[PDB]
Amino acid sequence: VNSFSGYLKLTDNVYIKNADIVEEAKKVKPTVVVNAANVYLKHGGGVAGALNKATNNAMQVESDDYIATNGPLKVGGSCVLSGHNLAKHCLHVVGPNVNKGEDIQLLKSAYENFNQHEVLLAPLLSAGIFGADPIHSLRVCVDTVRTNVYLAVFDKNLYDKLVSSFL
Numbered sequence: 001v002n003s004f005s006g007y008l009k010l011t012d013n014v015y016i017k018n019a020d021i022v023e024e025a026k027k028v029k030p031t032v033v034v035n036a037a038n039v040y041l042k043h044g045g046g047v048a049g050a051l052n053k054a055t056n057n058a059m060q061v062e063s064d065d066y067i068a069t070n071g072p073l074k075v076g077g078s079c080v081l082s083g084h085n086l087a088k089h090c091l092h093v094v095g096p097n098v099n100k101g102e103d104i105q106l107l108k109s110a111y112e113n114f115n116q117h118e119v120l121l122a123p124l125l126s127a128g129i130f131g132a133d134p135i136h137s138l139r140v141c142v143d144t145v146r147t148n149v150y151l152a153v154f155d156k157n158l159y160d161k162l163v164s165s166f167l
């Protein structure tokens with residue numbers, strides 16, 4: 001028994017709620033919150049900017065030191081850094097960006113990173129396909145992640161189509 005509340009059971013290990021992950025992070029203080037990062041860990045907008053803003057830019061300061069030491073992540077890769085005031089840990093995961101010509105097939109490799117953590121609060125990845133084929137992103141999560149994932153979905157048009165499609 002964990003502390004996630006109001007999430008709907010989608011599958012054996014996947015749960016889903018209509019909410020802003022940042023606001024959910026401010027609440028539960030989970031062991032792991034997932035960030036939909038870019039390979040430079042430049043947290044300008046979206047989940048990254050919203051998470052980073054909620055940390056008063058401490059996430060960005062830590063991230064810049066990480067990149068200066070290690071260089072950029074791979075698309076489909078991840079790193080574990082501090083969760084700051086939002087979680088014990090933040091798993092920064094890079095999904096492919098179709099807007100930059102990156103290959104959507106890398107989405108499965110991105111979700112595989114979740115399997116290194118028993119329980120995670122996470123968003124859907126590759127938001128660049130959210131108008132073209134939003135269902136594609138959630139199908140991969142369910143078919144790839146075997147650990148317990150609590151998905152916080154921001155868009156209500158989306159959540160309704162998603163839960164409808166998988167029930």
Ligand SMILES: O=C(Nc1ccc(C(=O)NCc2c(C(=O)O)oc3ccccc23)cc1)NC1CC1
Nearest residue numbers: 046047050124125126127130134137153154155
């Ligand atoms: O900006 C924020 N939050 C914030 C910002 C951005 C997101 C986000 O990239 N989600 C991913 C997503 C969603 C959804 O979540 O609807 O659907 C999808 C379909 C396909 C692929 C991906 C997705 C999530 C949360 N907060 C600030 C104003 C206070």
